[PDB]
Amino acid sequence: GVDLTGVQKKKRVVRHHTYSTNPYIKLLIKLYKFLGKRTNSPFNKLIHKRLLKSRNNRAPISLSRIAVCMRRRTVWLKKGKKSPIAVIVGDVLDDVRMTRIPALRICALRFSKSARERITGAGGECLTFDQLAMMAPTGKNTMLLRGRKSGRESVKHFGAAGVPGSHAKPHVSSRGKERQRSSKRRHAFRHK
């Protein structure tokens, strides 16, 4: 007499004796693992955790989407706290749109050459998380950037009973006209 498990011996899911081949990380985690739990800090823990995932699972983030974050400062406070801490567990890529945007401080895995520079050059600061953490324990006026995820292309290639509800692009062989796409962009052949 045992009884239903809601799924037995609970699946990897979010993972443990863990991931990639970069040495540093391995430290990081040792470092940080104490910190979130044993320096009671959800932020830290989070950090800690957040460190752990795989590359997809660390799809980048980029700059202008931080601009906004530094519009947030601006609608924050009159401003006793007058400072702010960005985190990204990936590389910070340059964006484009602005690129006359201000300086500021970003705490990343990697900043592109260009970016790194230009950011910094613009008075920015590229700090690696060692360069963060240490001198940044505990959040507060921290800004988790949780990356993105979505705008990968892969999901594009999720869906094809092309009903009026499903609008999605297959992994097929036309790279030009027809070659598997002959109607739909006409209503008629093999309908809808």
């Binding site: 430290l27 990081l28 040792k30 470092l31 104490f34 320096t39 060692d130 240490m134 324990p137």
Partner: peptide, 20 residues
């Protein structure tokens, strides 16, 4: 990447060690 090895040393800290 991280700019500093002896992280471990670092990790020992005092700030950190305070918030312990």
């Amino acid at each position: 990447m991280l700019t500093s090895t002896d992280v471990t040393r670092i990790m020992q800290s005092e700030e950190v060690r305070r918030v312990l």
